[PDB]
Amino acid sequence: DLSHLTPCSESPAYQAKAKSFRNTTSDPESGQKRAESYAEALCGPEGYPHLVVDGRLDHAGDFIIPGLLFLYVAGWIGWVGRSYLIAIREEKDTEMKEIIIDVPLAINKMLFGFMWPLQAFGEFTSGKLTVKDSEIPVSPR
Amino acid sequence: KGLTTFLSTAPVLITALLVFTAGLLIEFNRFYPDLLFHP
Amino acid sequence: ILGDFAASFLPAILVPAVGLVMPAVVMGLLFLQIESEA
Amino acid sequence: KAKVIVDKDPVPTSFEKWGKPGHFDRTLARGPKTTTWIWNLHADAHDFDSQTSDLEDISRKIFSAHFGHLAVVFVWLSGMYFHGAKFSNYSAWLADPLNIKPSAQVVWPVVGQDILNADVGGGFHGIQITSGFFQLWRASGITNEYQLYCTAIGGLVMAGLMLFAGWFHYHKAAPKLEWFQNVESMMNHHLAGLLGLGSLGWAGHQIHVSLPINKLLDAGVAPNEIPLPHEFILDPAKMAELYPSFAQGLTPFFTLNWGVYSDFLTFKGGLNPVTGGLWLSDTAHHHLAIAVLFIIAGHMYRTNWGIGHNMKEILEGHKGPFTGEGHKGLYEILTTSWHAQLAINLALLGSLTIIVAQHMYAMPPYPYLATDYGTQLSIFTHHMWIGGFLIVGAGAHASIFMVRDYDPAKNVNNLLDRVLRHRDAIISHLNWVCIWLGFHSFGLYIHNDTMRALGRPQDMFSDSAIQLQPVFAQWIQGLHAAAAGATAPFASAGVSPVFGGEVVAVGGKVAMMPITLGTADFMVHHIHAFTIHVTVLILLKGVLYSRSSRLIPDKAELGFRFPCDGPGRGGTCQVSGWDHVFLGLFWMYNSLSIVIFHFSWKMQSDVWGTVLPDGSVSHITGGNFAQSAITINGWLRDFLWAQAANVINSYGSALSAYGIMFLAGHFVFAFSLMFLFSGRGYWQELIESIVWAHNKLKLAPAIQPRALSIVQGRAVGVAHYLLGGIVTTWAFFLCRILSVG
Amino acid sequence: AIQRGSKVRILRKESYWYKDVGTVASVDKSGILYPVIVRFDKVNYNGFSGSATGVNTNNFAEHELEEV
Amino acid sequence: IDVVNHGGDPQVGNLSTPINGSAFTKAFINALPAYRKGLSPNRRGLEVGMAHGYLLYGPFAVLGPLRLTEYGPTAGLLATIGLVSILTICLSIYGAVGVSKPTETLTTPEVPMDLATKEGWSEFAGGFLLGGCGGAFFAFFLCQTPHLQPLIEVASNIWS
Amino acid sequence: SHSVKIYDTCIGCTQCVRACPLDVLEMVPWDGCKAGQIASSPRTEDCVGCKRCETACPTDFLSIRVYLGAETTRSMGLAY
Amino acid sequence: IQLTGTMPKFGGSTGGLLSAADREEKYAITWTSKTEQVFEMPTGGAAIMNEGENLLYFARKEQCLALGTQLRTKFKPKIEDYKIYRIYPTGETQYLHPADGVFPEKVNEGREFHGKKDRNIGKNPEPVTLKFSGKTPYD
Ligand code: CLA
Ligand code: CLA
Ligand code: CLA
Ligand code: CLA
């Protein structure tokens, strides 16, 4: 239940720090906005917010939402890269547009890269995502 | 015509991509600063 | 400086023997061993 | 003999080659089959000799690339003047230069970097700059930011003009090969026309602009009631009310009555007590004297009219018994090889930049330069680093000359042939003097560590202990302190307060003190000589053994830049001339780091500090160079541990970017050792393991991933090593001196 | 079945393109040990350090191959 | 006029410079105890050891842990004796391994044939021992008997 | 002395012999190649081990292969 | 045998013969030229190929073939007629580089198979087979 971690509003070390939060942007009340926004976290004896990473809810915003957001964005980047790499193979001049990127193909790969997990599941169930161990270069033992 | 091929090279496009990504992150942390976690 | 332990004169003999005398002997003997022909 | 002949439109201006990388090399044009193509694209982009075999095309490329480099430098200079004009407190600094720090860069508040805007005075928040631009503009007579804005606009116009000239001299009217071979005209126009006319124009500016504006500034007039420099020329009455020898015209110049110009052309010598800089009358007189001397020297060489020298009969006549044939072949060497010219020019520019560093600290040329310790420390450190880099590049290009441009047919029994013939006697005696200097410069420190550790303070090499007083340098200091009035009878004071005299102090801080030399100075100067000698040993060993050795006799066919000849002959690793530059970069790092450490400790302990009202000087550290700069533990404790208390406690303050850069340089130094220690065959096998995992998911790249080559691995390691160490020392120096200075 | 232009997979373990598919440039009919010249899309490691080029063909035997 | 010539054979890796082999360095190197024509071993070694033992009572007598103490000259003598003994052990084991004929250079066209054998290098080592002990003791006696001898005050005021 | 071994996957391109700096290698006639020749290493006691022959070999894995073994005064390449 | 040759006009260097050349072995290269030109020694510096036949001594075989490569390539008269010998201090001379009289890159009858394996390099025995014996897996 994390009795050692108190909420930052009830913690009497966070309230001493929260007066002297510096402004980060040009907004004059940015320190006060940070102070009110970090009060819902858990603070230790230092008076600083802590993040609990075990997938629980009311602390899913620490890791689960940023983690799923990164997984979507990184899957977007990797899937668009893999799609471009596959698309530039079977047209007999691949190093030149590996080094000088074909922009009209890359734009069509990028803007249609939002549906990366559906295409990933389709290629996984279709077997066209993973190359079989026979048709692949392997170093000598 | 030969200029668009130079702009389609890997360093020019990676520089444009990194400047666009850094600008997007900087413009996000200006308007919405101090996001340690999702509330 | 001699110590309060028993036989305090033995550091005054063994330490120069193990630090100067027998390393000179071992390097001379090993030099003759590793540099002799046949 | 010297005429202008060009080819009209030799290279068309088209963008078709912009989209075809690797066009300059035949091997780079087949296409990127491996990732080594990408690194070879940048490694051989400027090597114009490997691109074309015709020296005329190489010289044309070099001449047109110089204009692009000058355009880049002019963009940089215009950016600095624009930052002074728009984002600086220069107008605030001119009012109160003793309590307002120079700042010329504000930091945008998007994250918590708004703390990096230091409170420097006058209601201005920004980064305290240490470049010395503010003192330079005060010595230039610049009073308002509009004069900086005009100079920034002029810098942009000049940068565009240099870009247009670079396009013009490669695509519209490109000079022939014999336009470059007549170095007689080139050197005459660089001595008289560039250095001579440039210093004459600056002497005229310092007569007409810098001297009246700076005399009104030192007299106590605020800069916004100080008249602009053009009514000093338009109205000579205001110019002649101060320094009243402008009442008479230019006729005493032409009747050789130069003595009446003595009020504004002085030879005072010392420092200005008001500002702490050199007298601007001394600088104007100096620029006039060297302008006349350079213009005279620019009439030495025969160009078109019979009078003059040809720089060959000078070389032909210089021959002795120990050499025989002499300098025959050297004119053809320096007029057919660009690399020999770069090796000479880069060595002299590096030693020149080191001279600039060693001179501007002792004779500060600018008002309130010695008062701001951060500016003085930064310009000394920066010019030492630039100078040492240029010297190592000179060793590099001498090595490139020896395998790519040296011809044994033109060099029989001359100086270069005989240097190659007794290179073993050169390198072995240099090796001996390096070993001797290492023992009798570093073993003194080791002995001092041992006797200070063993409780033997009387057995050390100290001032209280066995003394090692530098009697020759002290004798030379005594000669310079007594030089004014005895051997320089028309100097008011010495050239610098370093050699003797009194404490020159401005405000409450010391401008300069006498710098007494003791046992610690002797020992650290011998370490300086030792490290310089080892850098000379590695670079000169790379030069002399560039073509051949007892190990690899056919080493010129392998080239300048090759990794090794193989594991044979015991293993011929790092045999090339490039790898000696690679090791000499580490040794210039070591040398110049010890130089700037000696500077940053000696000046902080014995020169810099505050002046008590009683008259004594309380220094920054407290004069601990006499007793702690004789031990490595003293250098670790009283210099590295003690003075880095500012860079590590800088977090949450205005100098926290320096602590960040301190840690960042530590990271890059540690990151270098992955490339320096490991080898290519580990990483190629690791990339082979990664390629299969990419092949498993159809992620095979068309350009096959290779590990970095052995020379590129060494280059990446040494570049990261130098970057991480230099950034660390920059951060440590600047955060220390922005807290104690 | 080994003829010029047929795509074929390498069975030499030590080859760079072990279990990789390349085309046949020529097959020699004389009595030599490795008559099948096979050219590949990728390039070998071969070359000096820093060399951007490498070989992409080699001779192979009949038993060192399989037709796809 | 080439003052820097070869030794008569250009393809040998050496040069006959003024310092190397001109007129005054061929003599005085051929006339040192090593390379002198008429001397036997245990006489070359005697002369070399006497010179070495005499010179080595300079950085032990006034440069040591006891140099501020009246036992300082005696400790310097003992240290010189110990260094001469270590060097004699080094010479003895160098000979006992087996020596070749010494290197002939431009300065020394004739090297001592008597030092090309193990028996000659044993005589050289014994002569070095006796010479080193004699030279160290002679320098000790000369430095000790006036008990101040203000030439020792020079280079000890320097090595304070 | 090093062991320079030439294997039967040799195309007889003679690049190893021209790349060899100490005349270790030569060409002998051979019926098992299209070029009609194979490399041989008779005076392999002169091999320093530089592997310039292994650098110049155009086979997928090298038909000429240097094994660094016992070190002599010629394998070290010592002028002294 | 006995090496009839005159030495090129060289000023003498420090990279030449050391003490082991007169005690262990030294090497020689003799070559005939019909013109006088300038060459670079592996010793260091430049020397003069005088008219006629030349004899040079070196401390290594690699220095002699580094000279022979400079005699073959990079010269317009294209000198191939060079012979390399080994001289032991006993006096014996062994004729080394053009043993058949033809260069090794050109095939010649009368040369036998040295170091030739009638097996693929991948078809080599494992070291675990050859444990505790003098035989190494490349035999
Ligand atoms: C299409 C691009 C792509 C894809 C999807 C993959 C995917 C893979 N890589 Mg990666 N990688 C790539 C490019 C790519 N990589 C490049 C450019 C580099 C060189 C820096 C590497 C070097 C590399 C290493 C060293 C390792 C991986 C690993 C892996 C695996 C785990 C993911 C990971 O660790 O990411 C790590 C990703 C990086 C370190 C760099 C990725 C760079 C960007 C994000 C790639 C996408 C941008 C691309 C340049 C342009 C897209 C094309 C566009 C024009 C449409 C996974 C199979 C690991 C593995 O084997 O796990 C099984 C492994 O150890 N990769
Ligand atoms: C990486 C290159 C680099 C960088 C970024 C800088 C940057 C800096 N330099 Mg520097 N410099 C360098 C290399 C570098 N320099 C080299 C290679 C030299 C040797 C020529 C110098 C010599 C130099 C001097 C002498 C001074 C600077 C100063 C400056 C500072 C202000 C710049 C300015 O406007 O000064 C403007 C300064 C001047 C115009 C005076 C320079 C006039 C010199 C004496 C004439 C040189 C003529 C010619 C170009 C060289 C010919 C060489 C000859 C042997 C043939 C700044 C920190 C100044 C400084 O520290 O002020 C606080 C300063 O006075 N530098
Ligand atoms: C007047 C100055 C001068 C000039 C123009 C030359 C000219 C040249 N040099 Mg160089 N050289 C010099 C100074 C000079 N150099 C100095 C100062 C060094 C000492 C370090 C050397 C050492 C040297 C060697 C060792 C070699 C050359 C070679 C080259 C040639 C091609 C360069 C190329 O294409 O590489 C372009 C490569 C780069 C631009 C990469 C540089 C990467 C650096 C480390 C980064 C810059 C530092 C920066 C502040 C880091 C910021 C990090 C941040 C972005 C994150 C060309 C003849 C090469 C050659 O001729 O090959 C046969 C060669 O191998 N140079
Ligand atoms: C602390 C680190 C360190 C040390 C000890 C050395 C040591 C050496 N370097 Mg250096 N170097 C280093 C790091 C180091 N380097 C690294 C990082 C690189 C960069 C890549 C190299 C690469 C390098 C090159 C490229 C060269 C050297 C050379 C030298 C030698 C200079 C001659 C000298 O000073 O002799 C005196 C020795 C010392 C000062 C070391 C301290 C020894 C003390 C004073 C004496 C103590 C001995 C002790 C009493 C013995 C009795 C103990 C008993 C139990 C055995 C010396 C052996 C140069 C060389 O060999 O030519 C001369 C040279 O060419 N260095």
Author numbering:
A (entry chain F): 1 to 141
B (entry chain J): 2 to 40
C (entry chain I): 1 to 38
D (entry chain A): 11 to 751
E (entry chain E): 2 to 69
F (entry chain L): 4 to 163
G (entry chain C): 2 to 81
H (entry chain D): 3 to 141
How does the study describe this entry?
Despite nearly 3 billion years of evolution, all oxygenic photosynthetic organisms use the same large pigment–protein complexes, known as photosystem I (PSI) and photosystem II (PSII), to convert solar energy to chemical energy. Both complexes use light to induce a charge separation event, then transport the high-energy electron, ultimately to be stored as a chemical bond. The first high-resolution structure of cyanobacterial PSI revealed a core antenna system comprised of 96 chlorophyll a (Chla) molecules, of which 6 are integral to the electron transport chain (ETC), while the remaining chlorophyll molecules function to harvest light and transfer excitation energy to the ETC. The PsaL subunit has been shown to be vital for these larger oligomeric complexes to form.
Local resolution calculations show that regions of the interior of the protein are resolved to the Nyquist limit of 2.1 Å, while surface- and membrane-exposed regions are resolved to 2.5 Å resolution. The complex contains 33 protein subunits, 288 chlorophylls, 72 carotenoids, 6 phylloquinones, and 9 iron–sulfur clusters as shown in Figure 3A. Interestingly, no density was observed for the Ca2+ ion in the PsaL subunit that was proposed to stabilize trimerization in previously solved trimeric PSI structures. Comparison of the PSI chlorophyll arrangement between C. aponinum and Synechocystis reveals a high degree of conservation, except for chlorophyll B40. This chlorophyll is located next to a seven amino acid insertion seen in the sequence alignment of PsaB that creates a loop sterically forcing chlorophyll B40 to shift its orientation in C. aponinum. As a result, the coupling between chlorophyll B40 and B19 changes. The PsaL subunit in C. aponinum reveals two drastically different features compared to Synechocystis: First, a large loop on the stromal side of the membrane and second, a C-terminus that does not bridge adjacent monomers through the coordination of a Ca2+ ion. Comparing the structures of Synechocystis and C. aponinum revealed that at the position of aspartate 73, one of the Ca2+ coordinating residues in Synechocystis, a leucine is present in C. aponinum. Unlike aspartate, leucine is an uncharged species which prevents the coordination of this Ca2+ ion. Furthermore, the C-terminus in C. aponinum is longer than Synechocystis and would sterically prevent oligomerization if adopting the same orientation as Synechocystis.
